[PDB]
Short mmCIF file of all heavy atoms in Angstrom, two decimals:
data_model
loop_
_atom_site.label_atom_id
_atom_site.label_comp_id
_atom_site.label_asym_id
_atom_site.label_seq_id
_atom_site.Cartn_x
_atom_site.Cartn_y
_atom_site.Cartn_z
N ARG A 54 0.53 6.21 0.32
CA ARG A 54 1.22 5.78 1.48
C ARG A 54 0.62 6.44 2.74
O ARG A 54 0.51 5.80 3.81
CB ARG A 54 2.75 6.06 1.39
CG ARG A 54 3.52 5.47 2.57
CD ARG A 54 4.96 5.13 2.13
NE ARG A 54 4.99 4.31 0.92
CZ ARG A 54 5.52 4.63 -0.26
NH1 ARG A 54 6.08 5.82 -0.36
NH2 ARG A 54 5.44 3.78 -1.23
N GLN A 55 0.25 7.71 2.66
CA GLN A 55 -0.40 8.40 3.72
C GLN A 55 -1.76 7.87 4.04
O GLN A 55 -2.18 7.79 5.16
CB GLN A 55 -0.47 9.96 3.39
CG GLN A 55 -0.98 10.79 4.57
CD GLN A 55 -0.07 10.76 5.79
OE1 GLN A 55 1.10 10.74 5.58
NE2 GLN A 55 -0.67 10.77 6.92
N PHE A 56 -2.52 7.53 2.95
CA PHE A 56 -3.81 6.92 3.24
C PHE A 56 -3.68 5.53 3.79
O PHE A 56 -4.42 5.07 4.65
CB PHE A 56 -4.65 6.79 1.92
CG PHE A 56 -5.99 6.20 2.13
CD1 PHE A 56 -7.00 6.99 2.70
CD2 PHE A 56 -6.23 4.93 1.85
CE1 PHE A 56 -8.23 6.53 2.89
CE2 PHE A 56 -7.53 4.39 2.10
CZ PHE A 56 -8.52 5.21 2.63
N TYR A 57 -2.58 4.82 3.37
CA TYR A 57 -2.22 3.50 3.89
C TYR A 57 -1.71 3.65 5.35
O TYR A 57 -1.45 2.58 5.91
CB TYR A 57 -1.15 2.96 2.99
CG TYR A 57 -0.74 1.52 3.24
CD1 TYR A 57 -1.76 0.49 3.29
CD2 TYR A 57 0.57 1.06 3.48
CE1 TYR A 57 -1.42 -0.82 3.51
CE2 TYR A 57 0.86 -0.27 3.73
CZ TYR A 57 -0.09 -1.19 3.72
OH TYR A 57 0.22 -2.55 3.96
N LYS A 58 -1.58 4.76 5.97
CA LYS A 58 -1.06 4.89 7.26
C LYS A 58 -2.00 5.54 8.33
O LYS A 58 -1.82 5.23 9.51
CB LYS A 58 0.32 5.54 7.19
CG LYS A 58 1.27 5.40 8.46
CD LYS A 58 1.12 4.08 9.30
CE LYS A 58 1.25 2.76 8.48
NZ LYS A 58 1.03 1.70 9.43
N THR A 59 -2.99 6.36 7.87
CA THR A 59 -3.78 6.84 8.95
C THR A 59 -5.09 6.19 9.04
O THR A 59 -5.57 5.86 10.20
CB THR A 59 -4.01 8.40 8.64
OG1 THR A 59 -2.78 9.07 8.64
CG2 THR A 59 -4.90 8.99 9.69
N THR A 60 -5.75 5.89 7.92
CA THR A 60 -7.02 5.07 8.06
C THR A 60 -6.80 3.60 8.11
O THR A 60 -7.72 2.82 7.98
CB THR A 60 -7.91 5.35 6.72
OG1 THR A 60 -7.09 5.25 5.51
CG2 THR A 60 -8.41 6.77 6.79
N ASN A 61 -5.57 3.17 8.39
CA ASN A 61 -5.20 1.71 8.47
C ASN A 61 -4.79 1.34 9.81
O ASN A 61 -5.41 0.45 10.46
CB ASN A 61 -4.07 1.46 7.45
CG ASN A 61 -3.86 0.02 7.24
OD1 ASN A 61 -4.45 -0.88 7.93
ND2 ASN A 61 -2.85 -0.31 6.44
N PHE A 62 -3.72 1.93 10.42
CA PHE A 62 -3.10 1.43 11.64
C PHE A 62 -3.07 2.48 12.79
O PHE A 62 -2.58 2.16 13.83
CB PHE A 62 -1.71 0.97 11.34
CG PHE A 62 -1.54 -0.48 11.02
CD1 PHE A 62 -1.14 -0.93 9.87
CD2 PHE A 62 -1.80 -1.37 12.12
CE1 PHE A 62 -1.02 -2.32 9.59
CE2 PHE A 62 -1.71 -2.79 11.93
CZ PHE A 62 -1.32 -3.17 10.60
N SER A 63 -3.57 3.64 12.51
CA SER A 63 -3.63 4.67 13.63
C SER A 63 -4.61 4.24 14.74
O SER A 63 -4.39 4.65 15.85
CB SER A 63 -3.99 6.03 13.07
OG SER A 63 -2.98 6.53 12.29
N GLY A 64 -5.62 3.50 14.39
CA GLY A 64 -6.61 3.10 15.38
C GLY A 64 -6.76 1.58 15.55
O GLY A 64 -5.76 0.83 15.82
N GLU A 65 -7.99 1.14 15.21
CA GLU A 65 -8.36 -0.26 15.27
C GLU A 65 -7.98 -0.93 13.96
O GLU A 65 -7.08 -0.51 13.31
CB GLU A 65 -9.87 -0.46 15.54
CG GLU A 65 -10.29 0.04 16.92
CD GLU A 65 -9.73 -0.82 18.02
OE1 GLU A 65 -9.51 -2.03 17.74
OE2 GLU A 65 -9.44 -0.28 19.08
N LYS A 66 -8.66 -2.08 13.68
CA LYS A 66 -8.32 -3.07 12.66
C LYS A 66 -7.80 -2.52 11.43
O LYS A 66 -8.19 -1.49 10.89
CB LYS A 66 -9.64 -3.83 12.26
CG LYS A 66 -10.48 -4.54 13.42
CD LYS A 66 -9.86 -5.09 14.67
CE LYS A 66 -8.66 -6.00 14.42
NZ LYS A 66 -8.04 -6.27 15.67
N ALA A 67 -6.79 -3.26 10.85
CA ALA A 67 -6.34 -3.02 9.50
C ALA A 67 -7.51 -3.17 8.54
O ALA A 67 -8.05 -4.24 8.38
CB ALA A 67 -5.21 -3.99 9.11
N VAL A 68 -7.98 -2.13 7.95
CA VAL A 68 -9.18 -2.13 7.22
C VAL A 68 -8.98 -1.85 5.72
O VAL A 68 -9.91 -2.03 4.93
CB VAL A 68 -10.19 -1.05 7.74
CG1 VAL A 68 -9.76 0.35 7.31
CG2 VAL A 68 -11.68 -1.33 7.47
N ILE A 69 -7.71 -1.53 5.35
CA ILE A 69 -7.41 -1.38 4.00
C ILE A 69 -6.10 -2.07 3.64
O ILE A 69 -5.26 -2.44 4.57
CB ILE A 69 -7.13 0.14 3.64
CG1 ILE A 69 -5.98 0.72 4.41
CG2 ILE A 69 -8.39 0.97 3.86
CD1 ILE A 69 -5.54 2.08 3.95
N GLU A 70 -5.94 -2.57 2.46
CA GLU A 70 -4.68 -3.13 1.99
C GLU A 70 -4.74 -3.17 0.40
O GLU A 70 -5.80 -3.39 -0.18
CB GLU A 70 -4.64 -4.72 2.39
CG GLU A 70 -3.44 -5.38 2.02
CD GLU A 70 -2.19 -4.80 2.66
OE1 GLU A 70 -2.12 -4.28 3.71
OE2 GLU A 70 -1.08 -5.01 2.03
N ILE A 71 -3.57 -2.87 -0.16
CA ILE A 71 -3.51 -2.72 -1.63
C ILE A 71 -2.38 -3.59 -2.19
O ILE A 71 -1.39 -3.95 -1.46
CB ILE A 71 -3.31 -1.28 -2.06
CG1 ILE A 71 -1.95 -0.72 -1.47
CG2 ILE A 71 -4.47 -0.34 -1.58
CD1 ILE A 71 -1.66 0.69 -2.02
N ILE A 72 -2.45 -3.88 -3.45
CA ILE A 72 -1.51 -4.72 -4.24
C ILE A 72 -0.87 -3.89 -5.19
O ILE A 72 -1.53 -3.22 -6.06
CB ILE A 72 -2.26 -5.91 -4.87
CG1 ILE A 72 -3.01 -6.78 -3.91
CG2 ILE A 72 -1.24 -6.74 -5.70
CD1 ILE A 72 -2.14 -7.40 -2.85
N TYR A 73 0.54 -3.87 -5.33
CA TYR A 73 1.16 -3.15 -6.33
C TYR A 73 1.39 -4.12 -7.55
O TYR A 73 2.31 -5.01 -7.44
CB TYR A 73 2.44 -2.56 -5.85
CG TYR A 73 3.37 -1.91 -6.90
CD1 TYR A 73 2.81 -1.21 -7.95
CD2 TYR A 73 4.74 -2.01 -6.85
CE1 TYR A 73 3.51 -0.57 -8.95
CE2 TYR A 73 5.52 -1.41 -7.80
CZ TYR A 73 4.91 -0.76 -8.83
OH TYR A 73 5.75 -0.19 -9.76
N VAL A 74 0.59 -3.98 -8.55
CA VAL A 74 0.80 -4.72 -9.80
C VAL A 74 1.65 -3.80 -10.71
O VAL A 74 1.26 -2.74 -11.13
CB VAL A 74 -0.50 -5.17 -10.50
CG1 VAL A 74 -0.25 -5.92 -11.74
CG2 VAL A 74 -1.38 -5.88 -9.51
N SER A 75 2.89 -4.25 -10.96
CA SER A 75 3.84 -3.35 -11.61
C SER A 75 3.67 -3.44 -13.14
O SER A 75 3.47 -4.45 -13.74
CB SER A 75 5.26 -3.85 -11.26
OG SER A 75 5.51 -3.74 -9.86
N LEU A 76 3.85 -2.24 -13.76
CA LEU A 76 3.98 -2.04 -15.18
C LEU A 76 5.37 -1.61 -15.57
O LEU A 76 5.47 -0.86 -16.58
CB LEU A 76 2.86 -1.16 -15.78
CG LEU A 76 1.50 -1.75 -15.52
CD1 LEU A 76 0.40 -0.77 -15.96
CD2 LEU A 76 1.39 -2.99 -16.38
N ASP A 77 6.33 -1.98 -14.83
CA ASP A 77 7.73 -1.57 -14.99
C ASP A 77 8.26 -2.14 -16.25
O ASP A 77 8.12 -3.27 -16.60
CB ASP A 77 8.58 -1.90 -13.76
CG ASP A 77 8.03 -1.16 -12.55
OD1 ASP A 77 7.50 -0.03 -12.66
OD2 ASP A 77 8.24 -1.70 -11.41
N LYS A 78 9.11 -1.33 -17.03
CA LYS A 78 9.67 -1.80 -18.25
C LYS A 78 10.98 -2.60 -18.08
O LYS A 78 11.55 -3.21 -19.00
CB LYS A 78 10.02 -0.64 -19.14
CG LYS A 78 8.82 -0.09 -19.86
CD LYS A 78 8.18 -1.09 -20.81
CE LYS A 78 9.15 -1.33 -22.01
NZ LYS A 78 8.59 -2.31 -22.95
N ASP A 79 11.54 -2.71 -16.79
CA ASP A 79 12.71 -3.47 -16.56
C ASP A 79 12.68 -3.96 -15.06
O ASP A 79 11.95 -3.46 -14.27
CB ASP A 79 14.01 -2.77 -16.88
CG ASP A 79 14.25 -1.55 -16.00
OD1 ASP A 79 13.29 -0.68 -15.91
OD2 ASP A 79 15.37 -1.40 -15.48
N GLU A 80 13.43 -5.02 -14.85
CA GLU A 80 13.48 -5.60 -13.52
C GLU A 80 14.08 -4.64 -12.47
O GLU A 80 13.57 -4.64 -11.31
CB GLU A 80 14.23 -6.93 -13.49
CG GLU A 80 13.54 -8.10 -14.28
CD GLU A 80 13.50 -7.92 -15.78
OE1 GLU A 80 14.42 -7.25 -16.32
OE2 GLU A 80 12.52 -8.38 -16.44
N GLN A 81 15.10 -3.91 -12.87
CA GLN A 81 15.71 -2.98 -11.94
C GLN A 81 14.78 -1.88 -11.40
O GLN A 81 14.95 -1.32 -10.39
CB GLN A 81 17.01 -2.38 -12.47
CG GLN A 81 18.14 -3.33 -12.53
CD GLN A 81 18.15 -4.30 -13.72
OE1 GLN A 81 17.57 -4.03 -14.72
NE2 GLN A 81 18.89 -5.40 -13.61
#
């Protein structure tokens, strides 16, 4: 989340973006 916030939106263009593909064992 910290990498998602300083090298992304602190300056110019949104240059990073990630997808959370979940391996969760239940919906909750």
Side-chain angles (χ1 to χ4, degrees):
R54 185 151 308 119
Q55 184 65 36
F56 182 76
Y57 189 53
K58 195 33 52 184
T59 300
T60 50
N61 189 359
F62 263 114
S63 290
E65 294 294 328
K66 304 331 310 173
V68 77
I69 62 170
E70 182 65 26
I71 62 170
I72 301 299
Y73 172 39
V74 183
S75 301
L76 294 175
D77 297 330
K78 282 295 292 181
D79 63 311
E80 294 65 33
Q81 283 84 21

